[PDB]
Each structure stands twice: as structure tokens, then as C-alpha cells.
Design a protein around this ligand. Sequence first.
Ligand SMILES: [Cl-]
Lengths: 313, 313
Amino acid sequence: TVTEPVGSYARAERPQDFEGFVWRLDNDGKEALPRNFRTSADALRAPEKKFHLDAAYVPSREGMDALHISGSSAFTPAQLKNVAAKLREKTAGPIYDVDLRQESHGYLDGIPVSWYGERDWANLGKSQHEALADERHRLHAALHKTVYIAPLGKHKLPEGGEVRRVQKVQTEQEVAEAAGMRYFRIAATDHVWPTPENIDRFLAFYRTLPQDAWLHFHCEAGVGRTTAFMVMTDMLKNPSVSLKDILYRQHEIGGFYYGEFPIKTKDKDSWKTKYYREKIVMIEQFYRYVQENRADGYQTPWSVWLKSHPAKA
Amino acid sequence: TVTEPVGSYARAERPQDFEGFVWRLDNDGKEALPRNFRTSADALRAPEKKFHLDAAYVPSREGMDALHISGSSAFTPAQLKNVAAKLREKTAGPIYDVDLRQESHGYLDGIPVSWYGERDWANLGKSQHEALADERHRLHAALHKTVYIAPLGKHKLPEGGEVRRVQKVQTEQEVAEAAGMRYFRIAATDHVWPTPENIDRFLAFYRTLPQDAWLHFHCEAGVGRTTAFMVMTDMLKNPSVSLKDILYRQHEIGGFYYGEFPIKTKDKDSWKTKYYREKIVMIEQFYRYVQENRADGYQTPWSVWLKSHPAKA
Ligand SMILES: [Cl-]
């Protein structure tokens, strides 16, 4: 009898040790677009050296032109409108803002902020229902109140910033709709493999999407969580494509590389090591899920299948 | 018809524009004693160049040996115990911790903190009662919660610091009593001349003091408010000493110089200029009060007398 199976390591951490303490600035709004903006129509580029991949390898692009997905970091409302305009030039279908952030976030006087706790785990352990309620209450409590908004600097602690008496509060859902995008929230915890709950929710959403739906995924930095769901989407929609091809191409259009690589962390980041290893294993397990459940149309939910086919470290 | 008389300029400022936003670290606890520690028995040092005083002038020390006052910046509990032990060597009377801070403050896990708003004006406009109620409520609410405690750095904004889940909360009164000192609170606003009610309260307290009472005054930095009350006490207890001598000597033992001098602030601090000028004029006016009302035993208080004898720019 194991306490936490592979893929749920984060359940072992104590939420009370990472509670929120400051309104973190999610984007300074200086660039026209959010960071790490990329689409499945982009050309592939050389791999990042840290992943020790074969730069000579040419990944298949099979299914990429019809994939219709994109990813990015968090954004200001003006940056999201620029994203929506860009994406509109590529499709006539609905464009979804797929918010993968479990952390409570929103917009204060138009400024994208989030309630940051150590490791960005201020909502760790909360059901999506509880995380969204925390977010609604906090945002609403900010209205007409003085707040401190700051970017993280030295050692993931506030550095500089600004103080203001808030005159307007908006949720990301409102900002997405204002940019002409549909909204869908998946409360995934920063830095770790999405939970069975996160993924079951994504799969049910994916099933009823119109054929021409375009999914724009984003988290805070636009790397970990964003690439995980872009990869899952690529596997679901292009099941005949090899694992290697999916991983290389999602990485080479500008995302994270989710295959085995020499994991190296600074000493103060050594806690990330097992989460990176867990993600590598789970990516493989999700691919296996896709290959073994597509013939009957995924009658068996990911959470259920995963409990009867546990992943191995 | 004047809206705010000289000595009450601060009443024109809007409290809602300086609300508290962070638990400021009041002292890092690295030294054995708080900063700017000084007593009336100390030797006079050369004057600070910024006041453009006469370095060859030797102020009379008449009455300094019997004055029995001291001053300093904020402190950790251990630092206050060191102060008390040091002061006990000089007297056998009660030793008072005279807390001049209007800003809400206290101790979290033994760490001296204050609820800081711009210009340290988070309690601006509150009566002493409201200021102390906010204080008790914010301290208590921190118990068993996660707080961010940081020192201010560039631009008076948080820089680094720490995050912790509080296990212990104490008011300064408790900390003073644990150090064996009596406690007296005067809620004076940082950076400005103490109000007529702050001073009436102090003079009423002063009259009740036994002859051998020792007063340890302090604020946040241990300069502005601390020296103002030290000067007032010196004038009250040594009414025959000239104004020039009181001002030079309180300065030369390590305090602020409260006489006329060429004021020069950095551009970001230009708002301080009129408050400095105001203090120079009020200092003289308080000296006149003492000189005109000591002979009859202060039958009329400072606030009433000031109203009849308004100071002028
Ligand atoms: Cl949930």
C-alpha cells in the first residue's frame, strides 16, 4: 500500500507551508506580446543545448497544420488582445483562452497579478472549486483597498514594485471575453505534473470542442504547464505521430522538452528534481493512455485508467 | 480664517493615500543595542555638518546629570533588555519605555515589525484610541498566519525579507514589561511636529512622574520624534538653560538639531521641507510656553495656550 502514486508526488507536500503572501506582478506590460508566445504553425528551431538532443533530427510535422494550438506566459489585457488578433488571422473557429493556473490571479487596475506563496503554491491542495473561490474573494477584497504589487527578484522575494489604491478589479475570464476569446480554466499547480482531476477535466473539454477550435494555453511563465497540455493535445489529435516526434516538435516551436534529459538544478532548486523526473515518466504514461484508449473513443477516464495502470518511477 | 494653523500642517494630508501595505522589519537584531542609543549623561560630540552649527560653541551642561532621559530607534526584545539593564545602572527609580510611534507595531515571533504605509503614515488621522485598536487587531490577526516581513530598501519599498507562519504575537507593552520597564504610549505621527494632543498627553504624564523616573524615548529611527520629546523634557526640567544650549546639547549627544538650519532634502524627499520648517517654529513656541507657564505650575495646557498664541511661519 503506497501513500502517493507516481504522478501525485505533490500531494505529499503541506499546503500550509506555502501560503500566499504578496500580489506578484505577472507581466510588466512592456512588450506587445506575452513571453514564449508560439503556435503549432511555427517553424521548428534548433533544440536548447540543455536538453542534449539531436539537432540533426528532423521531426515529422504530420498533423501540425491542423493542430491549431498556441502557448504563452501570462499577459496584460492589451497583450491578450494582440494575441487574439494574431490567432484570428489563422482560424475562423472559436479561440479559447485555456488558463492553466491553479494560483489565484486576476487584474487590478488592468495589471495582471497573482497571489504568490513560496514555489507559487498558494492554492496547493485545493479543489478547483476552492481555488476559484479563494480567487474571487481575494480579488473582490482588493477593490478600493491599498495593495502592494511587486515583481520577484532576489531569491523569489518581492523587490521594488508599487503601491496603489485599486479602482478596478477583473477576473481573467472577463479579460479573455473582452479580447474575443472563450475561457476555460484548469487549476494546475505550478512546477508539477497536472493532477488526474486536471487532466480528466481537460479531456472532457477536449471531446466537445468544435473541429475548428483553436486552443491558446498559458500559465505564468508559459513553459511547464503550458507545454504539458500542448503535448497532450498534440498526442490526442495526432495519435499516429511517434512520442519522439511529439516531444521534439513541441520543444522546437519554443516549449519545454518533456523527454529524458540530464536534469541539473541549482542547490536552492534541488526540490524540483523529482518533479521533473515525475513529469518525464507521466508524459510517457499519458502517451500510453492515448494509444490504448483511442480505439473505443476513451470510454475510460484518464484518472480511472491511471489507477489500474500506475506509472513507475 | 485659517484651515490648519502652524503646528498642524499634517492634518491637511489625506490618510487614504498612505495606507499600510507591508510588515516592515523595524530592526534586524544584529547589534546588542538599538540604533542612535544615547543618554543625557553622555559627552557632547562635534555637531553634524548638515546643520551648519558652530563647532567651537560649548553648550552649558547645567542639569544634564539629573535629567535622566535617553533615546533610541526601535529594538528587538533582547535589545530592549540590554537597554533596561544599562539604564538600571544609572538609577533606582522606575524606567519608562516611552513609545512615541503612531504607526501600528509589535512583535511577531520576537521580530519587531510595523504596519508600514507610504511615509510611514498608515495611522495618519486616527485618534490614539483608533491607532491602538488597529494595532491590537492587526497583531492578533497575524497569529498562526503567514506573513511577509521585509526591510525597506530602494525607494522605500520592500526588498528581500522573509516569510513565516507566526507562532507568537506580542505588543510593545508586553515586551517592555518583560524587560522590567514601565510603558507609556504617545501616538505621534512619523516625520512631523507632535500634535497638541500628543503634547498635552505627554505633559500630563510628565507631572505624575516621581523625581527619580528615567525616561527612555524612542520612535522608529530614533531621530525626529525621539529628539522632539527629549528636547521638551529638557526644557521642562531645566527651564533656566537657554534655548540655544538645549538644542545644541540634545543634538550633540546624538539627537536631531531642532534649531534653524539650511534645509536641503533630496528631490524625492521635498515633501519633508515644510515639515522641517514647521518643527523649527514649533520648537520655539513650546519653549515660550514653558517660559510663560512654568511659574504658575502650568494651570493652562499647551493646546489651549497654543490656540491663544498661534505660531507663525
Ligand atoms: Cl477539483
